[PDB]
Amino acid sequence: AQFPNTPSFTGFNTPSRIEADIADLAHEGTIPQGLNGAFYRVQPDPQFPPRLDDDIAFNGDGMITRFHIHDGQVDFRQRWAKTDKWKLENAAGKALFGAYRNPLTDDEAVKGEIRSTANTNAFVFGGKLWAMKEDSPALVMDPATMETFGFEKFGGKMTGQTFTAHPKVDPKTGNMVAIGYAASGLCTDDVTYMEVSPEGELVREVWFKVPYYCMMHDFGITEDYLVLHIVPSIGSWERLEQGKPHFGFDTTMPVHLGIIPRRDGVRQEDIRWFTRDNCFASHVLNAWQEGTKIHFVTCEAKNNMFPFFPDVHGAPFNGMEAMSHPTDWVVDMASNGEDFAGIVKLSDTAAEFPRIDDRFTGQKTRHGWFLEMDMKRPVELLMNCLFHKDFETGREQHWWCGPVSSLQEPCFVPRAKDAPEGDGWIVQVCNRLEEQRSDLLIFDALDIEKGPVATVNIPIRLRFGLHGNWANADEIGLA
Numbered sequence: 001a002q003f004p005n006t007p008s009f010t011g012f013n014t015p016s017r018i019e020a021d022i023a024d025l026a027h028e029g030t031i032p033q034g035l036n037g038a039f040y041r042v043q044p045d046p047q048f049p050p051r052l053d054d055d056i057a058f059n060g061d062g063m064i065t066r067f068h069i070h071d072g073q074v075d076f077r078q079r080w081a082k083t084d085k086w087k088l089e090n091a092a093g094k095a096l097f098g099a100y101r102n103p104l105t106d107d108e109a110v111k112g113e114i115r116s117t118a119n120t121n122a123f124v125f126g127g128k129l130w131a132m133k134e135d136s137p138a139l140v141m142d143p144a145t146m147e148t149f150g151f152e153k154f155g156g157k158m159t160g161q162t163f164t165a166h167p168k169v170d171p172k173t174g175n176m177v178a179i180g181y182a183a184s185g186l187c188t189d190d191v192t193y194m195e196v197s198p199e200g201e202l203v204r205e206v207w208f209k210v211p212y213y214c215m216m217h218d219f220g221i222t223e224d225y226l227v228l229h230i231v232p233s234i235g236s237w238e239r240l241e242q243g244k245p246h247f248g249f250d251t252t253m254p255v256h257l258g259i260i261p262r263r264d265g266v267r268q269e270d271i272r273w274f275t276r277d278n279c280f281a282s283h284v285l286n287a288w289q290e291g292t293k294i295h296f297v298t299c300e301a302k303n304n305m306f307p308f309f310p311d312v313h314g315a316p317f318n319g320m321e322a323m324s325h326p327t328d329w330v331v332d333m334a335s336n337g338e339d340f341a342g343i344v345k346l347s348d349t350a351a352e353f354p355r356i357d358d359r360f361t362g363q364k365t366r367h368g369w370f371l372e373m374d375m376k377r378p379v380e381l382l383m384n385c386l387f388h389k390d391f392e393t394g395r396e397q398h399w400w401c402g403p404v405s406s407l408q409e410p411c412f413v414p415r416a417k418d419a420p421e422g423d424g425w426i427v428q429v430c431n432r433l434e435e436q437r438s439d440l441l442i443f444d445a446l447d448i449e450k451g452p453v454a455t456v457n458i459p460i461r462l463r464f465g466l467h468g469n470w471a472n473a474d475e476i477g478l479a
């Protein structure tokens, strides 16, 4: 196939499209014997050249990578997420769906079809592997064979059109907590709040409305609440009719924070909204309650972080104002009015792709891990450091991948099911950009600054990844 000669399909973005198996990858150092499970991650990877002259990275078909770590070795398996899109285009021999989140650029033959690329998260829950994309139901797969089952509509009990790619698991109940925005159609202000039992059943689905339609990419949960940030990366049908990127950023609009009680029969009037001045925030580290306060830790930038979803008023992209920092948004359920109680910058380190020890989701956490952009480092060819913060001592650790590499999202793996918070490992893919290959790095999570304890060579160049997760062998049929 002939792909376009553009930055989205060349260099680091050259198409790969590899399905593969490798046993016992070559490595340096010591792979911890204590690791027994698998790290799943997803890369957008176009099956076909795009319908339009160009495309963006968020729009490639989801390709799922699994690193099965056991007995001191790492095995590699990679397979397509066989979405309806993937199947339809595979049969036609060509692209049928068009631009990102824009059905007006699709072939008439796929009108009304689910558009998901399942390319944003690879998540294990309830014995299934979930390949997720926030414009559609999630695609469920077999975590062991990595075959595709199909889209999860919960037998038809799901009434919304969409399902998040940033699900959260409630440690108290074991439920998956999810939202689905644009729930009644593209660009609508309807959102569902959903919980899924460990058994896979949709046990709650609550419809509500948000102040305005926007990219509701992530959210937080607390013991009693779902915490939803409303950030003005906005879209509209008018944008799509005109061929603009679906989203653009409006610096003139306020940011809101919605507090949704996690209970049955929640009404619109039960939801509380707080309001602050414009900023950009996408990913949520964690959120928790303290007394009457809710703490909501996100990575906040002064302005838009997506150059390909541009400023709606024509402004050129401002790299400096896209630097994000871990920030606590604090609201007080006992106050009157909409003002935030506090907006507290927690580090001067520029950081994104935040992660916690997910066993403590919705509770006060001591540790966070991030990708860091350290603009003071040499670059001889961009997230170039792993960053850990101990929020109780304030101590920060940094590990630099060197001047010819970059890093993908870290994932925390507990040492044992009863281990203290953060007692375990970080795994992450490293892009060896000059050598055109990839490594899987393994760190001691509380001592990242000494460097990885193992470097596992991947003889396939991996593409830009989005989100990834660990599951123990007994959760994925590999025990």
Ligand SMILES: Oc1ccc(/C=C/c2cc(O)cc(O)c2)cc1
Binding pocket: 058, 120, 133, 134, 217, 281, 282, 283, 305, 352, 353, 466
């Ligand atoms: O369909 C998609 C929609 C949104 C996203 C968001 C990705 C993202 C990437 C970053 O580097 C920082 C960030 O805060 C968010 C990915 C896929």
Ligand SMILES: [Fe+3]
Binding pocket: 166, 217, 218, 283, 467
């Ligand atoms: Fe994300």
